[PDB]
RNA sequence: AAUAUGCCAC
RNA sequence: CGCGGGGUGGAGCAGCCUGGUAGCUCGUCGGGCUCAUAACCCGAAGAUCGUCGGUUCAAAUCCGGCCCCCGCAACCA
RNA sequence: CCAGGGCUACACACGUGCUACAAUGGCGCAUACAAAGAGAAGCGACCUCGCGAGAGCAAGCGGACCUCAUAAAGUGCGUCGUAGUCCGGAUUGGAGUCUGCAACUCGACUCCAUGAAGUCGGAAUCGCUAGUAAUCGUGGAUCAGAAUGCCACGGUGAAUAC
RNA sequence: CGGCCGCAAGGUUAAAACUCAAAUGAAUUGACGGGGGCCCGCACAAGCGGUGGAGCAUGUGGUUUAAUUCGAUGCAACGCGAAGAACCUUACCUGGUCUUGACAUCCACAGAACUUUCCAGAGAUGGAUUGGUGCCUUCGGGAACUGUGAGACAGGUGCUGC
RNA sequence: GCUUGAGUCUCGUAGAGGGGGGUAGAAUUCCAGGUGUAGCGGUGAAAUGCGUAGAGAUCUGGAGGAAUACCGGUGGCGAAG
């Protein structure tokens, strides 16, 4: 059958929201697409960073873009001068002043998004994914996650019946909301079509 | 026999024909081919595998899409078969939906044209 | 159910006698949650049945039950090829619950005005077994004579 | 007590 | 060729011999049970009586022919 | 890309609902008791006019404040007295309000009139064991207008389970 | 078929031509049983109230039409996508029109844009044109917004959910 | 030549081993009669069938055929049947 969204099932209790900006009736339309927009702009134009999370932030006619990244040397460059263009394009599409900070993300190896994004790139570059997701969860139970789950679903290496294979290692609870699970989806656009991935890493409880 | 012994489903004597239009709307050259498949039910010797007398006296025609999937379901009206509708399916075994519809428009043809074909036709 | 129910719902007595057998024929006569409707109608039935005959309303209405309340009904059993109509003797309850859904049926099919003028009517010819109540429990018994032979079970 | 049947690649 | 019959819903039969009106079964149609079909259950419609012309107030019926279908007979030399 | 039309066509068949077939009711008059939600080219008091849909001026309120918005079933009195009926409301004629550039195809609503089929529904078939079923109203999303649907909210409130 | 036996039924001895790429035994995992045992669920039983009949609403099939757009169609489609088709939506039909295009980048040229007004046409669209002719500035040009001019392309609710 | 294979004799043993002949009781059926009434018999229900010409039931006396309850035992015998 079909599962609830691990993240979604436990954004208000042990999980945060990639949002927190309060408008009313009149701003929240509004504020959405220009939301939409700013993490679409900063998803495409920083796919090689490997961003892994984009919190926005609206205080007061303002907007404050927090991108936890896995390479901040990479997406900040020489002393400020990429993100000071990210800064100006993000404030332009935003329609009002912006403020960029970069975060700090220890382990990309622990991150659902990232260990995502890494397995669909090697699937673009035919690589074997058994051997990714493998590597992957092999990757994650030696950093120390107490679980993870990896699904690779679709035309799997060149077959014309698309399946869907999955490794496993340690304990992925999805029934448990306290359990921190950090759950996150990627698509690779392979020259035999798209192949989804999907990472569930249980990192603990409380 | 004489090459043409067909005739197509209208639903009254002058009933836009409710099969020409359902044929003209399968894609493409599949209308011809289905016509030469007529022909060859006319010839006696269409392939195997081809046609299959679904439930009643309904047979289906089939063509290609997946597995001789370009259907017609007809009925044979004495010497001369009368062609219901035309359609495309996806799955084997024509729906029953489209089956039953089929057996509608034979009822609606044999209250119309008539029951038993002509004596000499 | 094929585990066990807990004990029955209390019911609360009625409040002009506090007999909760007539709170029950209140429940029972009652259509669409109209409770306000189905104690007037009881009430004013049981004040007319009283004034005709001289009976208290409660014991009057007990003995109108009581002429209409069934001893042993019929119930299905497979064998094979038929039905068994084994008779089977009623627990009290069922027993009263039974001769006040018989008395309202015969009551709502009778063909008078006012339902409580139904009522009165047909609870006083229950009084004398002449209802449609009395005939349904005459041929509960009968049937039950009849199949008299698969008692046994 | 009666309760027959199931042809379209996979 | 003579004589006795018969022509009735889509099929098989009654009705008609006693002129005041056409039924049964199967079938057909619609619904129902079934995953679906058959069986089954519940409702409905259907023939103006071979045909012509008479009689009669009224013709499936009575009558006269005509048409077709059966049966018996078509012999003695 | 544009204006017209169609998705709204109707011999028929099926599904899911609404209103009914009445007196446990209908109608008239007075009156009690709710929860939850919405709202800024939006909700719109009060007041005046209209028989009513509604119109005019127009405060208040992005709101435990203001508006939507008097809940209805219920209770008290009268009436109808079993009749295709003061049941029931389809259909249709005339006159109108609002939205919208625009209501013929094809809106909702109001007034007057008309008042149908229906008297509890064959075979068959569905939901429900509790504040549930049944029954009564209210709100919202969609939305210029356009719910008997959908999603929620409360009021009354059972029988039965060997 | 021919021998032998038989009273006959037939027994006994015993091929071949063709035809298939299997037939078979024992165990294994399921599934199934009108097999057994033990259970459970409004599954039945016990009750209450419905549907099937009536009128209406809505969706579907079928007919119809130029079009009645497409999809879902055993339970698990059918008040379903659609949380709401007058134009729009709209994908369909009839006609009037456009083809680097309504929407994107990039090339060049021209021109600030913007606002108002008149004609014709169902409108699209085409004629005009009153006013406007600026925002920064390597003051010469770029930034925008518009038209033109070839394209590389753009566009597709076209097909394939096997 | 030898005796341990094979066989004979002597004594007993257990057995539905076989063939022939006789008989016993129980029971069904039929026949004759007595009592005795409207059902019997059958089935999942039913009907065909039997019965007021007197069935079924019950009793007496015959007739005749077949098989041997209990013992009865994955007990016995037989080369097998
Ligand atoms: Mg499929
Ligand atoms: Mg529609
Ligand atoms: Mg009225
Ligand atoms: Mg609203
Ligand atoms: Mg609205
Ligand atoms: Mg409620
Ligand atoms: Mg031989
Ligand atoms: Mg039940
Ligand atoms: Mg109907
Ligand atoms: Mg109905
Ligand atoms: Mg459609
Ligand atoms: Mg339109
Ligand atoms: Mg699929």
Same mark, same amino acid.
């Given at each position: 059958?079909?599962?609830?969204?691990?993240?979604?099932?436990?954004?208000? !209790?042990?999980?945060?929201?990639?949002?927190?900006?309060?408008?009313?009736?009149?701003?929240?339309?509004?504020?959405?697409?220009?939301?939409?927009?700013?993490?679409?702009?900063?998803?495409?134009?920083?796919?090689?960073?490997?961003?892994?999370? !984009?919190?926005?932030?609206?205080?007061?006619?303002? !907007?404050?873009?927090?991108?936890?990244?896995?390479?901040?040397?990479?997406? !900040?460059?020489?002393?400020?001068?990429?993100?000071?263009?990210?800064?100006?394009?993000?404030?332009?599409?935003?329609?009002?002043?912006?403020?960029?900070?970069?975060?700090?993300?220890?382990?990309?190896?622990?991150?659902?998004?990232?260990?995502?994004?890494?397995?669909?790139?090697?699937?673009?570059?035919?690589?074997?994914?058994?051997?990714?997701?493998?590597?992957?969860?092999?990757?994650?139970?030696?950093?120390?996650?107490?679980?993870?789950?990896?699904?690779?679903?679709?035309?799997?290496?060149?077959?014309?019946?698309?399946?869907?294979?999955?490794?496993?290692?340690?304990?992925?609870?999805?029934?448990?909301?306290?359990?921190?699970?950090?759950?996150?989806?990627?698509?690779?656009?392979?020259?035999?079509?798209?192949?989804?991935?999907?990472?569930?890493?249980?990192?603990?409880?409380? | 026999?004489?090459?043409?012994?067909?005739?197509?489903?209208?639903?009254?004597?002058?009933?836009?024909?409710?099969?020409?239009?359902?044929? /003209?709307?399968?894609?493409?050259?599949?209308?011809?081919?289905?016509?030469?498949?007529?022909?060859?039910?006319?010839?006696?010797?269409?392939?195997?595998?081809?046609?299959?007398?679904?439930?009643? /006296?309904?047979?289906?025609?089939?063509?290609?899409?997946?597995?001789?999937?370009?259907?017609?379901?007809?009925?044979?009206?004495?010497?001369?078969?009368?062609?219901?509708?035309?359609?495309?399916?996806?799955?084997?075994?024509?729906?029953?939906?489209?089956?039953?519809?089929?057996?509608?428009?034979?009822?609606?043809?044999?209250?119309?044209?008539?029951?038993?074909?002509?004596?000499?036709? | 159910?094929?585990?066990?129910?807990?004990?029955?719902?209390?019911?609360?007595?009625?409040?002009?006698?506090?007999?909760?057998?007539?709170?029950?024929?209140?429940?029972?006569?009652?259509?669409?949650?109209?409770?306000?409707?189905?104690?007037?109608?009881?009430?004013?039935?049981?004040?007319?049945?009283?004034?005709?005959?001289?009976?208290?309303?409660?014991?009057?209405?007990?003995?109108?039950?009581?002429?209409?309340?069934?001893?042993?009904?019929?119930?299905?059993?497979?064998?094979?090829?038929?039905?068994?109509?084994?008779?089977?003797?009623?627990?009290?309850?069922?027993?009263?619950?039974?001769?006040?859904?018989?008395?309202?049926?015969?009551?709502?099919?009778?063909?008078?005005?006012?339902?409580?003028?139904?009522?009165?009517?047909?609870?006083?010819?229950?009084?004398?077994?002449?209802?449609?109540?009395?005939?349904?429990?005459?041929?509960?018994?009968?049937?039950?004579?009849?199949?008299?032979?698969?008692?046994?079970?």
């Amino acid at each position: 059958g079909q599962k609830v969204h691990p993240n979604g099932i436990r954004l208000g !209790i042990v999980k945060p929201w990639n949002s927190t900006w309060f408008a009313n009736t009149k701003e929240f339309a509004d504020n959405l697409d220009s939301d939409f927009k700013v993490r679409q702009y900063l998803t495409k134009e920083l796919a090689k960073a490997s961003v892994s999370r !984009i919190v926005i932030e609206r205080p007061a006619k303002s !907007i404050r873009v927090t991108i936890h990244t896995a390479r901040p040397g990479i997406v !900040i460059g020489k002393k400020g001068e990429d993100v000071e263009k990210l800064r100006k394009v993000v404030a332009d599409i935003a329609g009002v002043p912006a403020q960029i900070n970069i975060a700090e993300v220890r382990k990309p190896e622990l991150d659902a998004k990232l260990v995502a994004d890494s397995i669909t790139s090697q699937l673009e570059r035919r690589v074997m994914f058994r051997r990714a997701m493998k590597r992957a969860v092999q990757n994650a139970m030696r950093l120390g996650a107490k679980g993870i789950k990896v699904e690779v679903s679709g035309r799997l290496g060149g077959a014309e019946i698309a399946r869907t294979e999955w490794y496993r290692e340690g304990r992925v609870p999805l029934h448990t909301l306290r359990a921190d699970i950090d759950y996150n989806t990627s698509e690779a656009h392979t020259t035999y079509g798209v192949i989804g991935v999907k990472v569930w890493i249980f990192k603990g409880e409380i | 026999a004489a090459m043409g012994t067909w005739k197509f489903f209208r639903a009254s004597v002058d009933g836009r024909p409710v099969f020409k239009k359902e044929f /003209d709307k399968l894609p493409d050259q599949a209308r011809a081919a289905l016509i030469v498949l007529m022909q060859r039910y006319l010839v006696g010797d269409l392939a195997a595998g081809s046609i299959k007398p679904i439930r009643g /006296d309904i047979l289906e025609l089939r063509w290609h899409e997946a597995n001789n999937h370009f259907r017609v379901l007809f009925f044979r009206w004495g010497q001369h078969p009368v062609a219901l509708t035309a359609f495309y399916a996806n799955q084997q075994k024509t729906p029953k939906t489209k089956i039953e519809t089929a057996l509608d428009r034979q009822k609606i043809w044999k209250r119309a044209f008539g029951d038993t074909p002509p004596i000499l036709e | 159910p094929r585990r066990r129910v807990i004990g029955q719902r209390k019911i609360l007595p009625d409040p002009k006698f506090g007999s909760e057998l007539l709170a029950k024929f209140v429940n029972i006569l009652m259509v669409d949650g109209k409770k306000s409707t189905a104690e007037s109608i009881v009430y004013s039935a049981l004040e007319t049945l009283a004034q005709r005959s001289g009976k208290s309303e409660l014991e009057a209405f007990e003995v109108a039950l009581e002429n209409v309340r069934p001893t042993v009904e019929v119930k299905s059993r497979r064998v094979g090829g038929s039905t068994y109509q084994v008779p089977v003797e009623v627990r009290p309850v069922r027993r009263n619950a039974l001769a006040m859904r018989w008395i309202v049926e015969a009551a709502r099919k009778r063909g008078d005005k006012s339902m409580a003028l139904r009522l009165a009517n047909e609870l006083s010819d229950a009084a004398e077994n002449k209802g449609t109540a009395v005939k349904k429990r005459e041929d509960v018994h009968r049937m039950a004579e009849a199949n008299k032979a698969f008692a046994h079970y």
